[PDB]
Structure formats: C-alpha cells, structure tokens
C-alpha cells in the first residue's frame, strides 16, 4: 500500500536528450531517429525575442549555426526546418536509442511525467497535470526549454509536451511535439498571463477512492446526492462539472471499494462545505486533483 | 521557478533491475557486475516466514533453485551466499550496463529516489525521506521487494535502500545494500510496529526558504528568536531539536534570501502556534519536511 506522486521511469527518454546551441542560446532537444526537435526560439537573440518574425530569422540561418551535442559526441546538422513552434534539425546519425514512440496531444486534466533537463543532461523527473487553463505547475529554470513530458504504455513512449516558457504567476507553458501550443500562449514577449483555473473534479474523486483503498475513511458518510445537486456545489467552489462519462470512468474504483460514485460525491460536497477540521487525507490537508483515475488504478 | 518533489532520472538503475524467482516467490534483484542482490526472504515459504532460520533454509538450496531473468534473458546462477538480510547470487555474466556505484547508508532526514519495480520491470519513480523512526512512506505492493532507493551525484549511483516489508501502519521498511535493516525491524513475522516519529525541523526550514525563493512571503515577520527558545517550541510540537550544525547548513539559503536562520525560526514558531489561516505554502496546507537543504539548493 501507500500512494505517492509517481513518475514513469525515465531511461527511455534520457537516451533521447541532446543539447542544442544557436548563437548564445543553449537549450535541450529530443533526438528521435535522425531528427532533433527543439523550441524554435533557440534562433532568437535578446532583441528579436520582443516581436520576432521566425520565418525571417530562420532563412538567415544555416545548418552550421546549429551545434548539437549528444553527451560528448557532436552531431552534424544536415537540414533544418520549422514546424509551428518547434524546429526539426536533420542530423547525419539516427539515434540508436530511439524507443518506440508516438506524438500525442493531451487534454486538460490528464497527467504526464516531465524529465527536466539542462545542457542536454537530465536533472530530475516528476509528475505534472495539464491544468484546465492549459498551463502546468512545473519546476523549470533557465536552460530547461526543450525538456519533454511523456507517458509510457508497455514499451512505447507517448510524448505530449515540450517546454517553452514561464508565465508571470510562475506556472509553465509549452507545446505538443508537433509544435502547437497548449493554450492561448505565444513564443514571444507579451503581457500574456494564465487565465482562470478550476479544480479537476473527477481527479479529486479518484484520489478520494485512493484514500479509501489505503485506509483513510473518516470522510465517508451514508448520505448520497444527485449529480445535478453535486454540480451546483461544484460550480460554487470553482470545480469542473461532473459528467456521466466521469461517473462511468470511476466505475472500477467504485466497484473495488463498494462506494457508489454519487456517495463519494456527497463526501466531497461535505469536504467542500466544511473543510477537514484539522484532519488529512493521504498526507494532505488539501483536496488533490492531479491524479487521474488511471493513475490511481495503476498504483493501487 | 517552481518547486516539485523531484526524483533522480532512473535510467542508470533501470538497467540493473532483474527478476529473481525461488519456488513460488517472485521479487526483484539488483544486478551489478556479476552479482545479483536481493532480499533473503525470497527463499522462504508461507510456513517458514513465521520464525525462519535462514541459515538452515539456505543450506537446503542449490544454485539451480534461483531463476534470474534480465528482461528476456535467463542468467545462470553459479554461486549463492547470504550477507545479513540480503542474498548475493553470483551469475555467469557481468551486467554490461553496470554504472559507477557505491553502497552508502543514509541518515534519518535524508532523501532518496525509489525505483518501484515488479517482476524485474520498473514501474515508477518517486522521492522518499528516511523518517526519524527509520521507516519510509512509500508506495509498494506485493512483488515490490528488492526495489531500490538511490541518489545520483555526477555519474555515480549511491544505492542506499532495498525494500523488504510493509508495517501495520502502511509505512515501509528495508535494508541498506549490505543487508542491514534501517531501524529495529526483522525479516520475519512479528507484531513489529513503527516507533513514534517526529518532524524533521531542518527540512521544514529549507522548504520555507524554497517558498521564499519562489515568491511565497506571507509567513515572514520582522521578529527573531533565540535557538533555545525555538527548541522549546519544537519540543512541544514534536519537532526535532535544531542544532548549530543545522543553522550552518542553512547558511547558503539564508544568504541567498537575506533572511537569517533564526528569523525563519521565528516564522516557523508562529506557523506552529497559529497554523496557516487558510493559506498555503508551495501548494501545501501543511509544513513539509521531506526536502533537505541540498534538495532545495539543487532545484532552486
Ligand atoms: C527556455 O529555457 C526558457 C525557460 C524558462 C526560463 C525561466 N523559467 C522557464 O520555464 N524560456 C524562456 O526564457 C522564454 C523564451 C520566450 C522567447 C518564449 N521566456 C520566458 O519564459 O520568459 C519569462 C521568464 C524568463 C526568465 C525567468 C522568469 C520568467
Ligand atoms: C516483498 O515484495 C513484500 C513487500 C510488501 C507487500 C505489501 N507491501 C510491501 O511493501 N514483502 C513482504 O510481503 C514481507 C515479507 C517478510 C518475510 C519480511 N512481509 C510483509 O510486508 O508483511 C506485511 C504485509 C504483507 C502483505 C500486505 C500488507 C502487509
């Protein structure tokens, strides 16, 4: 037993991380087969990064302006192109460590693991959720751009996130691996800011089921509620509405614990209206919303 | 910016994990050079595991009773021996993926990353602290024994923990890699239970410094306190006493933020006496004690 925020083992991704330098900008790239993917802002200078025209900036570059280092081996760049907000650097060597992979775009409310990297060297691994407002609450410093987020199913790495920037509130923004931003954000200097966020209700419910599986039962009750009455409470507390599909997704956890989904909703209603009264659930004094139902089943 | 519970990248350890079967018991082993290390209870049966005599149990075994699988390759066991609570299985092939490594024993209050594994296959990675009572609050199911904890410095893996058991409160116990238990626990069936735990004060202080570095300042004050007066409060709230060595270790974080250690102690005294009044620090409504000063410096 026990329940922890757990990342996927990172080895398969560590073998794909490289360093990309253009001018005085250093960041990370992802080396899959004979292509290195990286944020296109690697080509910008301080002056450009106000309102850059990336198509102009890139036509002024040559293959030799991109220095790619895979550990202690220089990779020779033989072609370059832009795809949305990522650059694709063709190199003369296919990565022999390329795993089976896919490029997937995730939905708000879904989780993934982040391999934070600096100078092409992995530094740490942690779990993130894509917030309803399309930001992530990560841990990223200068040099971390090009770090990736991913899930692993069987032997296949599904890459979902590449890191590009930090917003004024300290949260993080980036793109899918096709270079399309999550959320209404752009890789240039504006006053852009995260929009209002909400709590991921289906995930809070999943985490309450994880708590019951692990022996925390104090918040349970015999009462029940209707889906409509629960969603009235959710709206008041800035929680996302619960759909019948969410109820269906929680079915397996409800069956395992014998607690009907709408009974757990009544427990959550009481927690929202009364707080915890100095108690904790799975080591937290707040309701946690960054575990999906799948994350709970995977671990419990 | 941002601050997350972050594990070390696990690749170097993933390449060392194997499956060990003896009889009907399956668990994990650690394959370094031509030795596989695993919990000695792999040789027990249901009846034995009450009060086993491991020396007797092991003399009745042969090399061929140990089946070792490295991915989809069977390793041939050519010798076996017991070292404290671990078995050392000599195999006919040195692991070509053996990293530079050390076997270190950690202290209570120190952190490490855990690579949870089942059937010799890594499942997830997370950070743990060794509690003052020599347990860890992990996430381990049947089959997870032999999973290891480790830190990485430069290119060298310092293995510190091998998993053996779960105590009645749901916390976890295990040994160093020389097979010596952390804490007063034994690999047999008794009514053994975790002793009383305390909060790791130096780590709470480090995490408060991480909060300031990341823009949370509401708990700061102009007041200060004496070390003796603070330790009177620590005792009342079941916090470990703060030593001058802890103050020295916090020096760099104090210098970076300009907040003297004893000023931060005054803030902590107020948080202990008054709580948070509905506010949060780094996304928590509780005081977090599983980040060391080094963990904070590493990330911030
Ligand atoms: C790429 O390494 C970098 C990652 C940032 C740096 C601080 N925290 C991160 O996540 N990205 C940028 O510096 C980015 C470049 C634009 C052309 C998209 N701009 C950015 O994040 O600006 C905000 C900022 C910069 C430095 C510190 C704090 C916020
Ligand atoms: C080895 O895989 C296993 C790990 C346990 C199983 C449940 N959670 C864990 O961390 N260790 C044992 O089963 C261990 C064997 C003794 C001979 C040391 N005994 C143990 O942990 O017993 C308590 C327990 C067993 C099963 C479920 C819950 C608690």
CATH code at position B276? 1.10.1840.10
For residue A35, what is the domain's CATH number? Answer: 2.40.10.10
Q: Is B141 on the interface with A (CB under 8 A)?
A: yes
Q: Token match 């933020």: residue?
A: B257
Q: Is A104 on the interface with B (CB under 8 A)?
A: no
CB burial of residue B252 (10 Å; 0-12, 13-18, 19+)? middle
Q: Is B164 a catalytic residue?
A: no
Collapsing DSSP to helix, strand or coil, A151 comes out as: strand
> Is the shortest distance between the CB of B140 and ligand 2 below 6 Å?
yes
What own/partner pairs with CB < 8 Å and gap ≥ 24 does B240-246 have? B240/B109, B240/B132, B240/B198, B240/B199, B240/B200, B240/B201, B240/B202, B241/B201, B242/B201, B242/B202, B242/B205, B246/B201, B246/B202, B246/B205
Closest partner residue to B11 (CB to CB) among A3, A14, A137 is A14
> Is the shortest distance between the CB of A269 and ligand 1 below 6 Å?
no
CA distance B231 to B237: 10
Residue A47 belongs to domain spanning: 14-175
DSSP classification of residue B246: H
A113 and A257 assigned to the same domain: no
Which residues on neighbouring strands pair with residue B128, listed in sequence order? B112
Q: Which of A140, A175, A210 is the last residue of a domain?
A: A175
- Other Cβ atoms less than 10 A from the Cβ of A21: the count is 16
Q: Is B286 on the interface with A (CB under 8 A)?
A: yes
Answer yes or no: do B10 and A9 touch at CB < 8 A: yes
Residue of A16, A44, A145, A160 with catalytic role = A145
Phi, psi of B38 (to 5 degrees): -155, 160
CA distance A30 to A24: 19
B244 and B279 assigned to the same domain: yes
Task: Give the closest residue to A13 by CA, choosing from A26, A32, A27, A35.
Answer: A32
Task: Name the strands in the sheet holding A35-39, side by side, starting at the edge strand that comes first in the sequence.
Answer: A73-75, A67-70, A17-22, A25-32, A35-39, A86-91, A77-83
CA distance A147 to A266: 40
Asked, for residue A183, whether it belongs to a domain, the answer is no
B121 to chain A: closest CA residue: A9
Which ligand sits closest to the CA of B27?
2
- How far, in Å, is the centroid of ligand 2 from the Cα of A121? 37
B167 and B84 assigned to the same domain: yes
Q: Which of B157, B175, B193 is the last residue of a domain?
A: B175
> Is the shortest distance between the CB of B142 and ligand 2 below 6 Å?
yes
CA distance B57 to B52: 8
Answer yes or no: do B124 and A3 touch at CB < 8 A: no
| Residue A34, min C-alpha distance to chain B (Å) | 22
A23: tokens are 């001018």
Q: Is A166 on the interface with B (CB under 8 A)?
A: yes
Task: Give the closest residue to A219 by CA, choosing from A288, A261, A265.
Answer: A265
- Other Cβ atoms less than 10 A from the Cβ of B295: the count is 22
A34 and A168 assigned to the same domain: yes
What's the domain count of chain B?
2
Q: Is A10 on the interface with B (CB under 8 A)?
A: yes
Residues of A in contact with B172 (CB under 8 A): 2
A77 and A170 assigned to the same domain: yes
Residue of A39, A126, A142 with the most ligand 1 atoms within 8 Å of its CB, for mutation: A142
Residues of A in contact with B285 (CB under 8 A): 284-286
A170 and A219 assigned to the same domain: no
- How far, in Å, is the centroid of ligand 2 from the Cα of B289? 26
Asked, for residue B192, whether it belongs to a domain, the answer is no
A62: tokens are 């040559």
Asked, for residue A236, whether it belongs to a domain, the answer is yes
Residue of A22, A43, A44, A145 with the most ligand 1 atoms within 8 Å of its CB, for mutation: A145
Which ligand sits closest to the CA of A187?
1
Phi, psi of A151 (to 5 degrees): -125, 155
B103 and B228 assigned to the same domain: no
Q: Which of B175, B191, B221 is the last residue of a domain?
A: B175
- The resolution, in angstroms to one decimal, equals 1.5
Asked, for residue A9, whether it belongs to a domain, the answer is no
Closest partner residue to A137 (CB to CB) among B2, B166, B280 is B2
Contact predicate B125/B10, CB 8 Å: yes
B87 and B38 assigned to the same domain: yes
Q: Is B16 a catalytic residue?
A: no
Asked, for residue B3, whether it belongs to a domain, the answer is no
- Would you mind telling me the total number of residues written for chain B in this entry? 300
B4 to chain A: closest CA residue: A139
The Cα diameter of chain B in Å comes to: 69
Answer yes or no: do B14 and A15 touch at CB < 8 A: no
Which of left, alpha, beta for B183 (phi over 0: left; psi -120 to 50: alpha)?
left
B117 to chain A: closest CA residue: A9
Asked, for residue A187, whether it belongs to a domain, the answer is no
Answer yes or no: do A299 and B9 touch at CB < 8 A: no
Q: Token match 């102690």: residue?
A: B265
Asked, for residue B186, whether it belongs to a domain, the answer is no
B147 and B291 assigned to the same domain: no
B131 and B223 assigned to the same domain: no
Answer yes or no: do A139 and B171 touch at CB < 8 A: no
B295 to chain A: closest CA residue: A124
**Number of A–B residue contacts, CB under 8 Å:** 117
Asked, for residue B4, whether it belongs to a domain, the answer is no
Contact predicate A202/A288, CB 8 Å: no
Task: Give the closest residue to B210 by CA, choosing from A113, A166, A286, A139.
Answer: A139
Collapsing DSSP to helix, strand or coil, B167 comes out as: coil
Beta strands in chain A (DSSP E): 17-22, 25-32, 35-39, 67-70, 73-75, 77-83, 86-91, 100-103, 111-118, 121-129, 148-153, 156-166, 172-175
- CA B130 from chain centre, in angstroms, equals 5
B146 and B287 assigned to the same domain: no
B88 and B43 assigned to the same domain: yes
């Amino acid at each position: 037993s026990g329940f922890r925020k757990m990342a996927f083992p990172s080895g398969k991704v560590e073998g794909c991380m490289v360093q990309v330098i253009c001018g005085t900008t250093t960041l990370n790239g992802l080396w899959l087969d004979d292509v290195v993917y990286c944020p296109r802002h690697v080509i910008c200078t301080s002056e450009d990064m106000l309102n850059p025209n990336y198509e102009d900036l890139l036509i002024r570059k040559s293959n030799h302006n991109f220095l790619v280092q895979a550990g202690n081996v220089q990779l020779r760049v033989i072609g370059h192109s832009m795809q949305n907000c990522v650059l694709k650097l063709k190199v003369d060597t296919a990565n022999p460590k390329t795993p089976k992979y896919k490029f997937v775009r995730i939905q708000p409310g879904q989780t993934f693991s982040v391999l934070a990297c600096y100078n092409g060297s992995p530094s740490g691994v942690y779990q993130c959720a894509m917030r309803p407002n399309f930001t992530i609450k990560g841990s990223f410093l200068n040099g971390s751009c090009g770090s990736v987020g991913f899930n692993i199913d069987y032997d296949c790495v599904s890459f979902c996130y590449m890191h590009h920037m930090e917003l004024p509130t300290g949260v993080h923004a980036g793109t899918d691996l096709e270079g399309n931003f999550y959320g209404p954000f752009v890789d240039r200097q504006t006053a852009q800011a995260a929009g209002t966020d909400t709590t991921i209700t289906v995930n809070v419910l999943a985490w309450l089921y994880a708590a019951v599986i692990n022996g925390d039962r104090w918040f349970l009750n015999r009462f029940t509620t209707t889906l409509n009455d629960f969603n009235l409470v959710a709206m008041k507390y800035n929680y996302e509405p619960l759909t019948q599909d969410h109820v269906d997704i929680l079915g397996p956890l409800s069956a395992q614990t014998g607690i009907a989904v709408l009974d757990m909703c009544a427990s959550l209603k009481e927690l929202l209206q009364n707080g915890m009264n100095g108690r904790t659930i799975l080591g937290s004094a707040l309701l946690e919303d960054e575990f999906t139902p799948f994350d709970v089943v995977r671990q419990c």
